[PDB]
Amino acid sequence: AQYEDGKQYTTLEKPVAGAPQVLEFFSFFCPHCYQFEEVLHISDNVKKKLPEGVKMTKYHVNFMGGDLGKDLTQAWAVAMALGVEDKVTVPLFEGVQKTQTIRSASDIRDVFINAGIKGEEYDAAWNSFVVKSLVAQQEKAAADVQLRGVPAMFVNGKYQLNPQGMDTSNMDVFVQQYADTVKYLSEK
Ligand SMILES: OCc1ccccc1
Ligand SMILES: OCc1ccccc1
Numbered sequence: 194a195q196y197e198d199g200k201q202y203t204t205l206e207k208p209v210a211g212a213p214q215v216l217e218f219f220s221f222f223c224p225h226c227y228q229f230e231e232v233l234h235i236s237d238n239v240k241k242k243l244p245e246g247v248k249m250t251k252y253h254v255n256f257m258g259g260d261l262g263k264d265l266t267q268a269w270a271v272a273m274a275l276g277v278e279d280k281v282t283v284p285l286f287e288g289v290q291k292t293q294t295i296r297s298a299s300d301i302r303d304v305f306i307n308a309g310i311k312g313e314e315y316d317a318a319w320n321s322f323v324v325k326s327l328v329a330q331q332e333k334a335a336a337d338v339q340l341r342g343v344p345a346m347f348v349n350g351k352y353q354l355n356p357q358g359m360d361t362s363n364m365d366v367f368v369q370q371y372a373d374t375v376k377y378l379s380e381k
């Protein structure tokens with residue numbers, strides 16, 4: 194077949210009920226995630242082929258970067274709660290990995306202030322139980338898919354994208370196959 198279990202994707206032994214339709218895991222500390230998001234634009238390319246009414250969920254992970262990694266998961270929870278993911282994703286990636294000016298929770302907060310989020314609003318979100326719940330949600334989701342590394346993407350809580358089984362000989366062919374595979378899995 195054109196799409197084959199074990200090639201472009203794998204199948205979880207224990208599928209996850211109630212999982213988001215398309216669930217991506219990343220870290221702002223992860224060099225491959227920087228490439229994935231800032232160079233290859235995989236999430237955008239996946240969105241360009243997704244059907245009507247299929248939402249992309251992106252969760253941050255704790256296990257890269259120690260204390261700062263956890264601060265970044267909490268700040269990603271703030272971004273989701275305030276709906277500002279598309280204002281902070283690029284400056285957070287660049288602040289951690291390009292300029293390396295993000296070394297503390299305050300440096301993360303500066304990115305939000307510079308992007309126009311009011312200081313009192315960031316702080317209220319940062320300290321909120323809504324955000325603590327979103328942190329726990331991201332952690333539980335990683336547990337449910339038995340997450341072993343990032344970047345990773347899962348469809349319908351059943352299928353895991355397998356970029357190592359795709360055509361890596363050309364970056365455009367690769368990105369297209371990845372997005373095409375997500376669409377195939379969403380309809381599967
Ligand atoms: O991060 C954007 C960028 C990278 C390299 C050169 C110019 C701009
Ligand atoms: O500042 C830590 C970091 C730098 C470059 C790539 C990943 C993480």
Ligand SMILES: [Cu+2]
Nearest residue numbers: 359360366370
């Ligand atoms: Cu091909």
